[PDB]
């Protein structure tokens, strides 16, 4: 096996590829249409989904950029937002690109509050979406909540212009005594259980020791992240305060004393908590010693993809 060939394990797993499909359609749109479409999606979603407040540390890291935009005239505020959507090369776009996803999301969270209040230039009153934009919004509004929030996150992350990396502080791992242990029907594999339990405890230093030196983690609709340095950085930047709720799985032999394990269940992001349960598969390829050579995390097409 190579990392790129391991991508093919459990090929019956039907991923929600409508998500990258919809992001590709979104990316073609006029910048003003991109901003208006997300405004409309965000307003409707907020009627039933409450977004968690951005962390204090995140907001502090975004404060100077938010103040710069708040100080602009309305025309310049709209232009700054269009620059981000267009991935234009500007100082603000380079600052934005240096940020972790959570800082980018917190930035837009605060601009959305200020736009609702009228302190930052809002989407024009009675703005009508382009033909392509109206259809992209219709697609988004027809998706399950877990797919909707993934489209919005991916759209936000893709903005700005690419390097110095700015991320939230890493909260210390959960005290041992208060930690939960997951149970998975059909899976007792210590590596898989330790994966779930250490991620639920934000214990990234214990988690990274489960990998081979050349091992990779593949997040939903992303290329594999390869090697302990890159995987640990990903954990520390993006993987704080998740709740993994694995349900059931299957354990099979693979080539050369390797083991392949597929688990299905749900994950909660701290942005939505129990309000959005994303249907997830984990696909593990373990070496004979039980180290992770490859683990993929897939957003599933529907609840019918759960085992
Ligand atoms: C832009 C914009 C606006 C504001 C937009 C805002 C404010 C959007 C906010 C969106 C948010 C807050 C979305 C959050 C989504 C989070 C997700 C989808 C998280 C998923 C996590 C997963 C699936 C993790 C799974 C993993 C597992 C289980 C592992 O085992 C290993 C690690 C890992 C792979 C990470 C306004 C309105 C102003 C209009 C103008 C433009
Ligand atoms: N800098 C960390 C990296 C690490 C290795 N293993 C777990 N964590 C120590 O040393």
UniProtKB/Swiss-Prot annotation:
One Gene Ontology term from the biological process aspect of the record: light absorption
Consequence the record notes for mutating residue 42 to F: Acts like wild-type
Membrane topology: Peripheral membrane protein
Effect seen on changing residue 108 to S: Incomplete conversion to red form (OCP-R), no NPQ
OCP N-terminal domain mapped to chain residues: 16-163
Impact upon substituting residue 32 to A: Alters carotenoid specificity, <40% quenching, decreases stability of OCP-R, accelerates OCP-R to OCP-O reversion
Family annotation (Pfam families): Carot_N, NTF2
Keywords: Antenna complex, Chromophore, Membrane, Photoreceptor protein, Phycobilisome, Receptor, Sensory transduction, Thylakoid
InterPro entries membership: NTF2-like_dom_sf (IPR032710), NTF2_dom (IPR002075), Orange_carotenoid-bd_N (IPR015233), Orange_carotenoid-bd_N_sf (IPR036917)
PTM annotation, UniProt: Proteolytically cleaved into a red 16.7 kDa form named red carotenoid-binding protein (RCP) which lacks 15 residues from the N-terminus and approximately 150 residues from the C-terminus.
UniProt-annotated binding residues for echinenone: 32-42, 78-81, 105-115, 123-127, 149-159, 195, 239-244, 267-278, 282
Disruption phenotype: Loss of NPQ induced by strong white or blue-green light, cells are more sensitive to high light.
UniProt function note: Acts as a blue-light photoreceptor and photo-protectant. Essential for inhibiting damaged induced by excess blue-green light via a process known as non-photochemical quenching (NPQ). In the dark or dim light the stable inactive form (OCP-O) is orange, upon illumination with blue-green light it converts to a metastable active red form (OCP-R), inducing energy dissipation, quenching cellular fluorescence via NPQ. One OCP-R molecule is sufficient to quench 1 phycobilisome. More OCP-R accumulates under high-light and low temperature; in the dark OCP-R spontaneously reverts to OCP-O.
UniProt similarity note: Belongs to the orange carotenoid-binding protein family.
Protein name: Orange carotenoid-binding protein
Species, as recorded: Synechocystis sp. (strain ATCC 27184 / PCC 6803 / Kazusa)
């Amino acid at each position: 096996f190579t990392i790129d060939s391991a991508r093919g394990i459990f090929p019956n797993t039907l991923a929600a590829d409508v998500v990258p499909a919809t992001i590709a359609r979104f990316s073609q749109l006029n910048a003003e249409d991109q901003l208006a479409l997300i405004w409309f999606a965000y307003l409707e979603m907020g009627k039933t989904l409450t977004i968690a407040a951005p962390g204090a540390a995140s907001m502090q890291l975004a404060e100077n950029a938010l103040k710069e935009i708040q100080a602009m005239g309305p025309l310049q505020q709209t232009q700054a937002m269009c620059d981000l959507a267009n991935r234009a090369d500007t100082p603000l776009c380079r600052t934005y690109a240096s940020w972790s996803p959570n800082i980018k999301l917190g930035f837009w969270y605060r601009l959305g509050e200020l736009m609702e209040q009228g302190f930052v230039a809002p989407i024009p009153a009675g703005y009508q979406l382009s033909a392509n934009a109206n259809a992209v919004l219709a697609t988004i509004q027809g998706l399950e909540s877990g797919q909707q929030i993934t489209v919005l996150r991916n759209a936000v992350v893709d903005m700005g212009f690419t390097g110095k990396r700015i991320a939230e502080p890493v909260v210390p791992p959960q005290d041992t005594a208060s930690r939960t242990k997951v149970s998975i029907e059909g899976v007792t594999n210590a590596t898989v259980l330790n994966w779930m339990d250490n991620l639920n405890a934000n214990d990234f230093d214990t988690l990274i020791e489960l990998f081979t030196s050349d091992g990779a983690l593949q997040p939903p609709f992303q290329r594999p992240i390869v090697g302990k340095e890159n995987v640990l950085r990903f954990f520390r930047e993006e993987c704080q305060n998740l709740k993994l709720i694995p349900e059931r799985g299957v354990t099979e032999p693979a080539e050369d004393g390797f083991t392949q394990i597929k688990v299905t269940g749900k994950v909660q992001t701290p942005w939505f908590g129990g309000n959005v349960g994303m249907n997830i598969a984990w696909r593990f390829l373990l070496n004979p010693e039980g180290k992770i050579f490859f683990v993929a995390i897939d957003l599933l097409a529907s609840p019918k993809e759960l085992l």
